[PDB]
Coordinates of C-alpha atoms and ligand atoms in Angstrom, one line a residue:
Chain A
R10 CA -5.0 -20.5 36.9
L11 CA -7.4 -19.3 34.2
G12 CA -7.4 -15.5 34.8
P13 CA -9.7 -13.0 36.4
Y14 CA -12.4 -12.8 33.7
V15 CA -13.0 -16.6 33.9
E16 CA -13.6 -16.2 37.6
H17 CA -15.9 -13.3 37.1
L18 CA -17.9 -15.5 34.6
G19 CA -18.4 -17.9 37.5
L20 CA -17.1 -20.9 35.6
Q21 CA -16.2 -24.0 37.6
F22 CA -14.3 -26.6 35.8
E23 CA -15.0 -30.3 36.4
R24 CA -12.4 -31.3 33.7
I25 CA -9.6 -29.9 31.7
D26 CA -8.0 -32.7 29.7
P27 CA -6.0 -32.6 26.4
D28 CA -9.2 -33.7 24.7
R29 CA -12.1 -32.3 26.6
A30 CA -13.0 -29.6 29.1
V31 CA -16.2 -29.4 31.1
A32 CA -17.5 -26.4 33.2
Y33 CA -20.6 -25.6 35.1
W34 CA -22.1 -22.1 35.5
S35 CA -25.3 -20.2 35.9
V36 CA -27.2 -17.1 34.6
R37 CA -26.8 -14.4 37.3
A38 CA -28.5 -11.0 37.5
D39 CA -25.2 -9.2 36.8
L40 CA -24.9 -11.1 33.5
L41 CA -28.1 -10.0 31.9
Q42 CA -28.9 -7.7 28.9
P43 CA -31.8 -5.2 29.4
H44 CA -34.6 -7.7 28.6
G45 CA -33.8 -10.0 31.5
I46 CA -32.1 -12.8 29.6
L47 CA -28.3 -13.7 29.4
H48 CA -26.2 -11.2 27.5
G49 CA -25.1 -13.1 24.3
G50 CA -21.5 -12.0 24.9
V51 CA -21.6 -14.1 28.0
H52 CA -22.2 -17.2 25.9
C53 CA -19.3 -16.3 23.6
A54 CA -17.0 -15.7 26.6
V55 CA -17.9 -19.0 28.1
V56 CA -17.3 -20.7 24.8
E57 CA -13.9 -19.0 24.5
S58 CA -13.0 -19.9 28.1
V59 CA -13.8 -23.6 28.0
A60 CA -12.2 -24.2 24.6
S61 CA -9.0 -22.2 25.3
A62 CA -8.5 -24.1 28.6
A63 CA -8.7 -27.4 26.7
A64 CA -6.5 -26.1 23.9
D65 CA -3.9 -24.8 26.3
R66 CA -3.9 -28.1 28.2
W67 CA -3.5 -30.1 24.9
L68 CA -0.5 -27.9 23.9
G69 CA 1.0 -28.4 27.3
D70 CA 4.7 -27.8 27.8
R71 CA 5.2 -27.5 24.1
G72 CA 4.0 -23.9 23.9
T73 CA 1.0 -21.7 24.3
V74 CA -2.2 -20.7 22.5
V75 CA -3.8 -17.4 21.5
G76 CA -7.4 -16.8 20.5
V77 CA -7.9 -16.3 16.7
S78 CA -11.7 -16.3 16.3
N79 CA -15.0 -17.3 18.0
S80 CA -18.3 -18.0 16.4
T81 CA -21.2 -18.7 18.8
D82 CA -24.9 -19.5 18.0
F83 CA -27.5 -18.7 20.7
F84 CA -30.4 -21.2 20.4
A85 CA -32.6 -20.6 23.5
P86 CA -32.9 -17.5 25.9
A87 CA -31.4 -18.2 29.3
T88 CA -32.4 -16.7 32.6
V89 CA -31.8 -17.2 36.3
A90 CA -34.7 -19.6 36.2
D91 CA -33.0 -21.9 33.8
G92 CA -30.6 -23.3 36.5
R93 CA -27.2 -24.8 36.0
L94 CA -25.6 -24.7 32.5
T95 CA -22.9 -27.2 31.4
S96 CA -20.3 -26.2 28.8
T97 CA -18.3 -29.0 27.1
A98 CA -15.4 -28.4 24.7
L99 CA -14.5 -31.0 22.2
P100 CA -11.7 -30.9 19.7
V101 CA -12.3 -30.5 15.9
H102 CA -8.7 -30.2 14.8
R103 CA -5.5 -30.1 16.8
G104 CA -2.5 -29.5 14.6
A105 CA 0.9 -27.8 14.4
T106 CA -0.1 -24.2 14.1
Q107 CA -3.9 -24.2 14.6
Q108 CA -6.6 -25.7 16.9
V109 CA -10.4 -25.6 16.4
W110 CA -12.6 -26.7 19.3
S111 CA -16.4 -27.0 19.5
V112 CA -18.2 -26.0 22.7
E113 CA -21.9 -26.8 23.6
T114 CA -23.7 -25.2 26.4
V115 CA -26.8 -27.2 27.7
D116 CA -29.2 -27.0 30.5
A117 CA -29.9 -29.8 33.0
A118 CA -32.5 -31.3 30.6
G119 CA -29.9 -31.5 27.8
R120 CA -31.5 -28.6 25.9
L121 CA -28.9 -26.9 23.7
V122 CA -28.7 -23.3 24.8
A123 CA -25.7 -22.2 22.8
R124 CA -22.9 -23.7 20.7
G125 CA -19.6 -22.1 19.6
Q126 CA -16.4 -22.8 17.7
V127 CA -13.1 -21.3 18.7
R128 CA -10.0 -21.2 16.5
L129 CA -6.7 -20.9 18.3
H130 CA -3.0 -20.4 17.1
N131 CA -0.2 -22.4 18.6
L132 CA 2.8 -20.5 19.9
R133 CA 5.3 -23.3 20.0
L134 CA 8.6 -23.2 22.0
Chain B
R10 CA -30.5 1.3 29.9
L11 CA -28.2 -1.4 28.3
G12 CA -28.1 -3.8 31.3
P13 CA -25.6 -4.7 34.0
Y14 CA -23.2 -6.7 31.9
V15 CA -22.7 -3.8 29.5
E16 CA -21.8 -1.6 32.6
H17 CA -19.4 -4.2 33.8
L18 CA -17.6 -4.3 30.5
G19 CA -17.0 -0.5 30.9
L20 CA -18.5 0.6 27.6
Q21 CA -19.3 4.3 27.3
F22 CA -21.4 5.1 24.3
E23 CA -20.8 8.2 22.3
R24 CA -23.6 7.4 19.8
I25 CA -26.6 5.0 19.4
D26 CA -28.4 5.8 16.2
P27 CA -30.7 3.7 14.0
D28 CA -27.6 3.3 11.7
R29 CA -24.5 3.5 13.9
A30 CA -23.3 3.0 17.5
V31 CA -20.0 4.0 18.9
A32 CA -18.5 3.1 22.3
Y33 CA -15.2 3.6 24.0
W34 CA -13.6 1.3 26.5
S35 CA -10.3 -0.1 27.7
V36 CA -8.5 -3.2 28.7
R37 CA -8.6 -3.6 32.4
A38 CA -6.7 -6.1 34.7
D39 CA -9.9 -7.9 35.5
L40 CA -10.7 -8.5 31.9
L41 CA -7.5 -10.5 31.1
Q42 CA -6.8 -14.1 30.3
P43 CA -3.8 -15.8 32.1
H44 CA -1.1 -14.5 29.7
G45 CA -1.9 -10.9 30.5
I46 CA -3.8 -10.0 27.3
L47 CA -7.6 -9.3 26.9
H48 CA -9.8 -12.4 27.2
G49 CA -11.1 -13.0 23.7
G50 CA -14.6 -13.3 25.1
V51 CA -14.5 -9.7 26.0
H52 CA -14.1 -8.7 22.4
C53 CA -17.2 -10.9 21.5
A54 CA -19.2 -9.3 24.3
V55 CA -18.2 -5.8 23.3
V56 CA -19.1 -6.6 19.7
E57 CA -22.4 -8.0 20.9
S58 CA -23.1 -5.0 23.0
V59 CA -22.5 -2.3 20.4
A60 CA -24.3 -4.1 17.6
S61 CA -27.4 -5.0 19.7
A62 CA -27.7 -1.5 21.0
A63 CA -27.8 -0.1 17.4
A64 CA -30.1 -2.9 16.3
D65 CA -32.5 -2.2 19.1
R66 CA -32.5 1.5 18.4
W67 CA -33.2 0.9 14.8
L68 CA -36.2 -1.3 15.5
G69 CA -37.4 1.3 18.0
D70 CA -41.0 1.3 19.1
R71 CA -41.7 -1.4 16.4
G72 CA -40.6 -4.3 18.5
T73 CA -37.4 -5.8 20.1
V74 CA -34.3 -7.7 19.1
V75 CA -32.8 -10.9 20.4
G76 CA -29.3 -12.2 19.7
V77 CA -29.0 -15.0 17.2
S78 CA -25.2 -15.4 16.6
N79 CA -21.9 -13.7 16.9
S80 CA -18.7 -14.3 15.0
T81 CA -15.6 -12.2 16.1
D82 CA -12.1 -12.2 14.8
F83 CA -9.2 -11.1 17.0
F84 CA -6.4 -9.6 15.0
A85 CA -4.0 -8.1 17.7
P86 CA -3.4 -8.8 21.3
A87 CA -4.7 -6.1 23.6
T88 CA -3.4 -5.0 27.0
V89 CA -3.8 -2.2 29.5
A90 CA -0.9 -0.6 27.7
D91 CA -2.8 -0.2 24.5
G92 CA -5.1 2.5 25.8
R93 CA -8.6 3.4 24.7
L94 CA -10.4 1.1 22.3
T95 CA -13.2 2.4 20.0
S96 CA -16.0 0.0 18.9
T97 CA -18.2 1.1 15.9
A98 CA -21.2 -0.9 14.8
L99 CA -22.4 -0.5 11.2
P100 CA -25.4 -2.2 9.6
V101 CA -25.1 -4.9 6.9
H102 CA -28.8 -5.8 6.6
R103 CA -31.8 -4.4 8.4
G104 CA -35.0 -6.3 7.4
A105 CA -38.3 -7.5 8.5
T106 CA -37.2 -10.6 10.6
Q107 CA -33.3 -10.3 10.7
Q108 CA -30.6 -7.8 11.2
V109 CA -26.9 -8.2 10.6
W110 CA -24.4 -5.6 12.0
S111 CA -20.6 -5.4 11.7
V112 CA -18.5 -4.0 14.6
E113 CA -14.9 -2.9 14.4
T114 CA -12.8 -2.4 17.4
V115 CA -9.7 -0.2 16.9
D116 CA -7.0 1.5 19.0
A117 CA -6.2 5.2 18.9
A118 CA -3.9 4.7 15.9
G119 CA -6.6 3.1 13.9
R120 CA -5.1 -0.3 14.3
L121 CA -7.8 -3.0 13.9
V122 CA -7.9 -5.0 17.2
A123 CA -11.0 -7.0 16.5
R124 CA -14.0 -7.3 14.2
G125 CA -17.3 -9.1 14.6
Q126 CA -20.6 -9.7 12.9
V127 CA -23.8 -10.1 15.0
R128 CA -27.1 -11.5 13.6
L129 CA -30.3 -10.5 15.4
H130 CA -33.9 -11.5 15.2
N131 CA -36.7 -8.9 15.2
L132 CA -39.5 -9.6 17.6
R133 CA -42.1 -7.2 16.1
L134 CA -45.3 -5.9 17.8
Chain C
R10 CA -5.1 -17.7 -14.4
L11 CA -7.7 -18.3 -11.7
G12 CA -8.4 -22.1 -12.3
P13 CA -11.2 -24.1 -13.9
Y14 CA -13.7 -23.8 -11.1
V15 CA -13.7 -20.0 -11.3
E16 CA -14.4 -20.2 -15.1
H17 CA -17.2 -22.6 -14.5
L18 CA -18.8 -20.1 -12.0
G19 CA -18.8 -17.6 -14.9
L20 CA -16.9 -14.9 -13.0
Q21 CA -15.5 -12.1 -15.1
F22 CA -13.1 -9.8 -13.3
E23 CA -13.0 -6.1 -13.9
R24 CA -10.3 -5.5 -11.3
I25 CA -7.7 -7.6 -9.2
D26 CA -5.6 -5.1 -7.2
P27 CA -3.6 -5.6 -4.0
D28 CA -6.5 -3.9 -2.2
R29 CA -9.7 -4.7 -4.1
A30 CA -11.1 -7.2 -6.6
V31 CA -14.4 -6.8 -8.5
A32 CA -16.1 -9.4 -10.6
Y33 CA -19.4 -9.7 -12.4
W34 CA -21.5 -12.9 -12.9
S35 CA -25.1 -14.0 -13.1
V36 CA -27.4 -16.7 -11.9
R37 CA -27.7 -19.5 -14.5
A38 CA -30.0 -22.4 -14.7
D39 CA -27.1 -24.9 -14.0
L40 CA -26.3 -23.0 -10.7
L41 CA -29.7 -23.5 -9.1
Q42 CA -31.0 -25.5 -6.1
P43 CA -34.3 -27.5 -6.6
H44 CA -36.6 -24.5 -5.8
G45 CA -35.3 -22.3 -8.7
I46 CA -33.0 -20.0 -6.7
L47 CA -29.2 -19.9 -6.6
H48 CA -27.6 -22.7 -4.7
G49 CA -26.1 -21.1 -1.7
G50 CA -22.8 -22.8 -2.1
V51 CA -22.4 -20.7 -5.3
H52 CA -22.4 -17.5 -3.2
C53 CA -19.7 -19.1 -1.0
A54 CA -17.6 -20.1 -4.0
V55 CA -17.9 -16.6 -5.5
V56 CA -17.0 -15.1 -2.2
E57 CA -14.0 -17.4 -2.0
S58 CA -12.9 -16.7 -5.6
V59 CA -13.0 -12.9 -5.4
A60 CA -11.3 -12.7 -2.0
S61 CA -8.5 -15.2 -2.8
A62 CA -7.7 -13.5 -6.1
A63 CA -7.2 -10.2 -4.3
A64 CA -5.3 -11.9 -1.4
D65 CA -3.0 -13.7 -3.9
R66 CA -2.4 -10.4 -5.7
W67 CA -1.6 -8.6 -2.5
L68 CA 1.0 -11.3 -1.5
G69 CA 2.4 -11.1 -5.0
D70 CA 5.9 -12.3 -5.6
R71 CA 6.4 -12.8 -1.8
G72 CA 4.6 -16.1 -1.6
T73 CA 1.2 -17.7 -2.0
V74 CA -2.1 -18.0 -0.1
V75 CA -4.3 -21.0 0.9
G76 CA -7.9 -20.8 2.0
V77 CA -8.5 -21.3 5.8
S78 CA -12.2 -20.5 6.2
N79 CA -15.2 -18.9 4.6
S80 CA -18.4 -17.5 6.3
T81 CA -21.0 -16.3 3.9
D82 CA -24.5 -15.0 4.7
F83 CA -27.3 -15.0 2.1
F84 CA -29.7 -12.1 2.4
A85 CA -31.9 -12.3 -0.6
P86 CA -32.9 -15.2 -3.1
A87 CA -31.3 -14.8 -6.4
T88 CA -32.7 -16.1 -9.8
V89 CA -32.0 -15.7 -13.5
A90 CA -34.4 -12.8 -13.4
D91 CA -32.2 -10.8 -11.1
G92 CA -29.7 -10.0 -13.7
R93 CA -26.0 -9.1 -13.2
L94 CA -24.4 -9.6 -9.8
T95 CA -21.3 -7.6 -8.7
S96 CA -18.9 -9.1 -6.1
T97 CA -16.4 -6.8 -4.5
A98 CA -13.6 -8.0 -2.2
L99 CA -12.2 -5.5 0.4
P100 CA -9.4 -6.1 2.8
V101 CA -10.0 -6.5 6.6
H102 CA -6.5 -7.4 7.7
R103 CA -3.4 -8.2 5.5
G104 CA -0.6 -9.3 7.8
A105 CA 2.4 -11.6 7.9
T106 CA 0.8 -15.0 8.3
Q107 CA -3.0 -14.3 7.8
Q108 CA -5.3 -12.3 5.6
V109 CA -9.0 -11.6 6.1
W110 CA -11.1 -10.2 3.2
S111 CA -14.7 -9.2 3.1
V112 CA -16.8 -9.7 -0.1
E113 CA -20.2 -8.2 -0.9
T114 CA -22.4 -9.5 -3.7
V115 CA -25.0 -6.9 -4.9
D116 CA -27.5 -6.6 -7.8
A117 CA -27.7 -3.7 -10.2
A118 CA -29.9 -1.7 -7.8
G119 CA -27.3 -2.0 -5.0
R120 CA -29.4 -4.6 -3.1
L121 CA -27.1 -6.8 -0.9
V122 CA -27.6 -10.4 -2.0
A123 CA -24.8 -12.0 -0.1
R124 CA -21.8 -11.1 2.0
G125 CA -18.9 -13.3 3.1
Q126 CA -15.6 -13.2 5.0
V127 CA -12.6 -15.3 3.9
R128 CA -9.6 -16.1 6.0
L129 CA -6.4 -17.0 4.2
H130 CA -2.9 -18.3 5.3
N131 CA 0.2 -16.7 3.7
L132 CA 2.8 -19.3 2.4
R133 CA 5.8 -17.0 2.2
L134 CA 9.0 -17.6 0.3
Chain D
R10 CA -34.3 -34.2 -7.0
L11 CA -31.5 -31.9 -5.7
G12 CA -30.9 -29.6 -8.5
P13 CA -28.3 -29.2 -11.2
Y14 CA -25.6 -27.7 -9.1
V15 CA -25.5 -30.7 -6.8
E16 CA -25.1 -33.0 -9.9
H17 CA -22.3 -30.8 -11.2
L18 CA -20.5 -31.2 -7.8
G19 CA -20.7 -35.0 -8.3
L20 CA -22.3 -35.7 -5.0
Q21 CA -23.7 -39.2 -4.6
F22 CA -26.0 -39.6 -1.6
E23 CA -26.0 -42.8 0.4
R24 CA -28.5 -41.5 2.9
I25 CA -30.9 -38.6 3.3
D26 CA -32.9 -39.0 6.6
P27 CA -34.6 -36.5 8.8
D28 CA -31.5 -36.7 11.1
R29 CA -28.5 -37.4 8.9
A30 CA -27.3 -37.2 5.3
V31 CA -24.2 -38.9 3.8
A32 CA -22.8 -38.2 0.4
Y33 CA -19.6 -39.4 -1.4
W34 CA -17.6 -37.3 -3.9
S35 CA -14.1 -36.8 -5.2
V36 CA -11.8 -33.9 -6.2
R37 CA -11.7 -33.5 -10.0
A38 CA -9.6 -31.5 -12.2
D39 CA -12.5 -29.1 -13.0
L40 CA -12.9 -28.3 -9.3
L41 CA -9.4 -27.0 -8.7
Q42 CA -8.0 -23.6 -7.9
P43 CA -4.8 -22.5 -9.7
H44 CA -2.3 -24.3 -7.4
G45 CA -3.8 -27.7 -8.1
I46 CA -5.9 -28.2 -4.9
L47 CA -9.6 -28.2 -4.4
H48 CA -11.2 -24.7 -4.7
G49 CA -12.4 -23.9 -1.2
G50 CA -15.8 -22.8 -2.5
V51 CA -16.3 -26.4 -3.5
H52 CA -16.1 -27.5 0.2
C53 CA -18.7 -24.8 1.1
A54 CA -21.1 -25.9 -1.7
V55 CA -20.8 -29.5 -0.7
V56 CA -21.4 -28.6 3.0
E57 CA -24.4 -26.5 1.9
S58 CA -25.7 -29.4 -0.3
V59 CA -25.5 -32.2 2.3
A60 CA -27.0 -30.1 5.1
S61 CA -29.9 -28.5 3.1
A62 CA -30.8 -32.0 1.8
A63 CA -31.1 -33.3 5.3
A64 CA -32.9 -30.1 6.6
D65 CA -35.4 -30.3 3.7
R66 CA -36.0 -34.0 4.4
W67 CA -36.6 -33.2 8.1
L68 CA -39.1 -30.4 7.4
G69 CA -40.8 -32.9 4.9
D70 CA -44.4 -32.1 4.0
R71 CA -44.6 -29.4 6.6
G72 CA -42.9 -26.7 4.4
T73 CA -39.5 -25.9 2.8
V74 CA -36.0 -24.6 3.7
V75 CA -34.0 -21.6 2.5
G76 CA -30.3 -21.2 3.1
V77 CA -29.4 -18.4 5.6
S78 CA -25.7 -18.8 6.2
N79 CA -22.7 -21.1 5.8
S80 CA -19.4 -21.2 7.7
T81 CA -16.9 -23.8 6.5
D82 CA -13.3 -24.4 7.7
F83 CA -10.7 -26.0 5.5
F84 CA -8.3 -28.2 7.5
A85 CA -6.3 -30.0 4.8
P86 CA -5.5 -29.4 1.1
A87 CA -7.4 -31.9 -1.2
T88 CA -6.4 -33.2 -4.6
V89 CA -7.3 -35.9 -7.0
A90 CA -4.7 -38.0 -5.3
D91 CA -6.7 -37.9 -2.0
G92 CA -9.4 -40.3 -3.3
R93 CA -13.1 -40.5 -2.1
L94 CA -14.4 -37.9 0.3
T95 CA -17.3 -38.5 2.6
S96 CA -19.6 -35.7 3.8
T97 CA -21.9 -36.3 6.7
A98 CA -24.5 -33.8 7.9
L99 CA -25.7 -34.0 11.5
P100 CA -28.2 -31.8 13.2
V101 CA -27.4 -29.2 15.8
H102 CA -30.8 -27.6 16.2
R103 CA -34.1 -28.3 14.4
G104 CA -36.8 -25.9 15.5
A105 CA -39.8 -24.0 14.4
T106 CA -38.2 -21.3 12.3
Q107 CA -34.5 -22.2 12.2
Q108 CA -32.3 -25.2 11.6
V109 CA -28.6 -25.5 12.1
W110 CA -26.6 -28.5 10.7
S111 CA -23.0 -29.5 11.0
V112 CA -21.2 -31.2 8.1
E113 CA -17.9 -33.0 8.3
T114 CA -15.9 -33.9 5.1
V115 CA -13.3 -36.8 5.7
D116 CA -11.1 -38.9 3.5
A117 CA -11.0 -42.7 3.6
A118 CA -8.6 -42.6 6.5
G119 CA -10.9 -40.5 8.6
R120 CA -8.8 -37.4 8.2
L121 CA -10.9 -34.3 8.6
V122 CA -10.6 -32.3 5.4
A123 CA -13.3 -29.7 6.0
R124 CA -16.2 -29.0 8.4
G125 CA -19.0 -26.5 8.1
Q126 CA -22.2 -25.3 9.7
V127 CA -25.2 -24.3 7.8
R128 CA -28.2 -22.2 9.1
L129 CA -31.5 -22.7 7.4
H130 CA -34.9 -20.9 7.6
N131 CA -38.1 -23.0 7.7
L132 CA -40.8 -21.8 5.4
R133 CA -43.8 -23.6 6.9
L134 CA -47.1 -24.3 5.2
Ligands
5NE201 C1 -30.1 -3.6 24.4 C2 -30.1 -5.1 23.9 C3 -31.2 -5.6 23.3 C4 -31.1 -7.0 22.8 C5 -30.0 -7.8 23.1 C6 -28.9 -7.2 23.7 C7 -27.7 -8.0 23.9 C8 -27.5 -9.4 23.5 O1 -27.7 -9.6 22.3 O2 -27.2 -10.3 24.3 C9 -26.6 -7.3 24.6 C10 -26.7 -6.0 25.0 C11 -27.8 -5.3 24.8 C12 -28.9 -5.8 24.1
5NE202 C1 -5.9 -20.3 29.5 C2 -6.0 -19.5 28.2 C3 -4.9 -19.5 27.3 C4 -5.1 -18.7 26.0 C5 -6.3 -18.0 25.8 C6 -7.3 -18.0 26.7 C7 -8.6 -17.2 26.5 C8 -8.7 -16.4 25.2 O1 -8.8 -17.0 24.2 O2 -9.0 -15.2 25.3 C9 -9.6 -17.3 27.5 C10 -9.4 -18.0 28.7 C11 -8.2 -18.7 28.9 C12 -7.2 -18.7 28.0
5NE203 C1 -32.8 -29.4 -1.6 C2 -32.6 -28.0 -1.1 C3 -33.5 -27.2 -0.4 C4 -33.2 -25.9 0.0 C5 -31.9 -25.3 -0.2 C6 -30.9 -26.1 -0.8 C7 -29.5 -25.6 -1.1 C8 -29.2 -24.2 -0.7 O1 -29.3 -24.0 0.6 O2 -28.7 -23.4 -1.5 C9 -28.7 -26.3 -1.7 C10 -29.0 -27.7 -2.2 C11 -30.3 -28.3 -1.9 C12 -31.2 -27.4 -1.3
5NE204 C1 -5.9 -17.7 -7.1 C2 -6.2 -18.5 -5.8 C3 -5.2 -18.7 -4.8 C4 -5.3 -19.4 -3.7 C5 -6.7 -19.9 -3.3 C6 -7.7 -19.7 -4.3 C7 -9.1 -20.3 -4.0 C8 -9.4 -21.0 -2.7 O1 -9.2 -20.3 -1.7 O2 -9.9 -22.1 -2.8 C9 -10.1 -20.0 -5.0 C10 -9.8 -19.3 -6.2 C11 -8.5 -18.8 -6.4 C12 -7.5 -19.0 -5.5

């Protein structure tokens, strides 16, 4: 129940709690930019996906969230050879009107591949 | 020659110059998050695509660019009903090692839907 | 009527309109970091000052603004030798609850020294 | 040995290690914006100060660092009444050419007042 774009990214969630979300995924040939590494927009969309899932789960029955902004840094190039990536969203602030979550994407060795912050607005019932 | 992820986004470039890139696209049902609006990661990936295309074209035969970071703000929700979006990348700084580009995504009425900055690193021959 | 920190920065405003603010200032020895160039935080505070002044002026009698976030890029080192800097704030979005402004700091030659975006929240009467 | 602007901020460092820096400070009347809360630029400058100190200490004899960009979020208003703030810088990435550090400013109760990321460039000998 995360939408069609999340499915196309290939994210597979191990956990979506009010205080953490974890998802596994992989570089795929269709996700590349012309020099054979991951298109940077894919990192941003993964960061957006894992944070908004957690933010939505935290808000729960009390309303719904809308994305406000996303700032993602790319620290290493990623290819199909780099295997399974893990993206973990952790909360920075969870308040009445705003949420900010931090998402780290790491490889199996724990090497930080990307890291992003997502700001969300709470639409409360 | 922009890679498979750019094609999947549906971007169609009117212009890729050393100082500006313009691309048209549209919200599509496969690009949505669960509440029927555009997945925010799609805005980030579009911003990344149009800026990196321009940055790569500016660097030209002198080398190649790698994405460093992307910060995109979402100002209005976007649906299939909102029609054709236009994303324009304009340069902020184009130097020896770094480039920063600003990308605005607007609807046909000129309403600002999203806006992002992309930092790139120059890999020079 | 901009507060004591703005005065300590040495900002001198030529213009504070609902759609633009302009201020002149200069690197000073007390504003430096240990290697003799401008402390980067000074760029951020100048960006915050010129944008919030404009945002507050735009909101006018209808309420007041509070800073939400600030993202500033530093493109060139600045010293006392670099003379008079000009910081211009231009609006990106001015809505019901949020404002986003973009501020460019340039030297006399038009060389871009720094550039920042400031997000503000509208506290409406 | 941190420069005159750091002194004017009133930062007092408990720790500057290659992997963490901690500094205490306080809102002061001269640091305010016109509505009696901390000028947001002060948060950015504190974030810049504590991260660059740590980054410089990590690089050590091998070279020196220059600020590249700073993104700070303000989560609560801060006044003189809020007492002693603690700013802690932790490393996100420390590589050959780039460093990224994350800085959290909290009050005595552990309430998150501000949080910023600083990107630095390594000038290596
Ligand atoms: C053409 C090109 C070069 C370098 C990078 C890119 C990216 C990217 O930054 O991920 C995305 C799309 C196209 C790119
Ligand atoms: C589940 C959910 C709620 C609200 C927003 C989202 C987004 C988004 O922020 O675009 C992306 C993916 C899932 C979302
Ligand atoms: C010690 C040091 C080195 C390099 C940079 C700095 C900065 C700065 O980034 O402006 C601020 C404060 C201290 C610094
Ligand atoms: C005039 C005004 C209103 C609201 C906020 C500010 C700030 C600030 O954003 O900290 C800085 C300088 C002036 C301000």
